[PDB]
Amino acid sequence: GEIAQALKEIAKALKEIAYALKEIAQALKG
Amino acid sequence: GEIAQALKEIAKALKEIAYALKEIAQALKG
Amino acid sequence: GEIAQALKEIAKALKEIAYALKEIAQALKG
Amino acid sequence: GEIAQALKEIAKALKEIAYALKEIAQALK
């Protein structure tokens, strides 16, 4: 249903954010 | 089903965010 | 059940996020 | 309905966010 779909799309967004922040972690460590 | 999967993907995403943010804490503190 | 477990993992994840962000706040302000 | 509207706004938001994060990936890599 609609809630299932909403949350699947949110899951995807947060997984890309995980990735972005892991790249930032590395960049700042030097 | 679909709800179980949605929430399991949110669990995974949020656990990677916990990790990423702790690596940021470390980077910024030295 | 799968939903019960999913929600327990969300609870846990958000407690680690709360903490991580406290550490970030502190790094930057002090 | 309220959920119908929420999801219409969410689709748009997430398409912009997808792109933003693609630009971030590229900047760093």
Added chain:
Amino acid sequence: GEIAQALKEIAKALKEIAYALKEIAQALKG
């Protein structure tokens, strides 16, 4: 009504995260 509000707040939060990470990307490039 509670779920409608939850989802609206997620949408907004993720747009602010997108922005913050664009600013971080730029800082580290420059």
Added chain:
Amino acid sequence: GEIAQALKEIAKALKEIAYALKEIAQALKG
């Protein structure tokens, strides 16, 4: 009700992340 609460707590967490990351942006612009 448990899902509604989970997502309300996610909204809160992600709003605090927005804050943290905007403070990082500023710190690194230095």
